[PDB]
Amino acid sequence: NDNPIPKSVPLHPKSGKYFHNLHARDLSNIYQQCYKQIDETINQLVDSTSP
Amino acid sequence: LKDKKPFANTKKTLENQVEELTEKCSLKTDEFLKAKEKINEIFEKLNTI
């Protein structure tokens, strides 16, 4: 209506290219680095405190 | 012939929205770079500590 701007259209193969390209950016390396850091911090704290 | 011109106007609007896509991608990449550099620096500070 009015301005010919449809709300949505069916997917196109050219648009399918970008749809296949779109992905959620990963945190696996970040999460594993954080886990290793906190684990080694705990291990250090195990004997760090004065007896 | 009369109806053709609004299609060209919508083409201009959609090319402007593609420019907006480019700007949004640029700012998202900036945010990613900043956040990654910050977390890497925090990790490095933890390593130094």
UniProtKB/Swiss-Prot annotation, chain A:
Which compartment or compartments is the protein found in? Answer: Nucleus; Cytoplasm
| Function noted in UniProt | Acts as an E3 ligase mediating SUMO/Smt3 attachment to SMC5 and YKU70. Acts in a DNA repair pathway for removal of UV-induced DNA damage that is distinct from classical nucleotide excision repair and in repair of ionizing radiation damage. Functions in homologous recombination repair of DNA double strand breaks and in recovery of stalled replication forks.
Task: Relay the record's extra comment.
Answer: Present with 2800 molecules/cell in log phase SD medium.
**UniProt similarity note:** Belongs to the NSE2 family.
Q: Oligomeric state and partners?
A: Component of the Smc5-Smc6 complex which consists of KRE29, NSE1, NSE2/MMS21, NSE3, NSE4, NSE5, SMC5 and SMC6.
Name of the molecule in the record: E3 SUMO-protein ligase MMS21
Q: Which organism is it from?
A: Saccharomyces cerevisiae (strain ATCC 204508 / S288c)
Shown residues in whole-protein numbering: 4 to 54 of 267
Swiss-Prot record, chain B:
Comment field on protein domains: The flexible hinge domain, which separates the large intramolecular coiled coil regions, allows the heterotypic interaction with the corresponding domain of smc6, forming a V-shaped heterodimer.
Per the UniProt record, the lineage of the source organism begins with: Eukaryota, Fungi, Dikarya, Ascomycota, Saccharomycotina
The subunit field of the Swiss-Prot or TrEMBL record says: Component of the Smc5-Smc6 complex which consists of KRE29, MMS21, NSE1, NSE3, NSE4, NSE5, SMC5 and SMC6.
**Interval of the full protein contained in this chain:** 300 to 348 of 1093
Indicate the transmembrane segments per the record.
none
Query: Which family, according to the similarity comment?
Result: Belongs to the SMC family. SMC5 subfamily.
This chain's function reads: Acts in a DNA repair pathway for removal of UV-induced DNA damage that is distinct from classical nucleotide excision repair and in repair of ionizing radiation damage. Functions in homologous recombination repair of DNA double strand breaks and in recovery of stalled replication forks.
Q: How is it modified after translation?
A: Sumoylated by MMS21.
The source organism is Saccharomyces cerevisiae (strain ATCC 204508 / S288c)
- Miscellaneous information on this protein: Present with 892 molecules/cell in log phase SD medium.
- Name of the molecule in the record: Structural maintenance of chromosomes protein 5
Subcellular location(s): the record lists: Nucleus; Chromosome
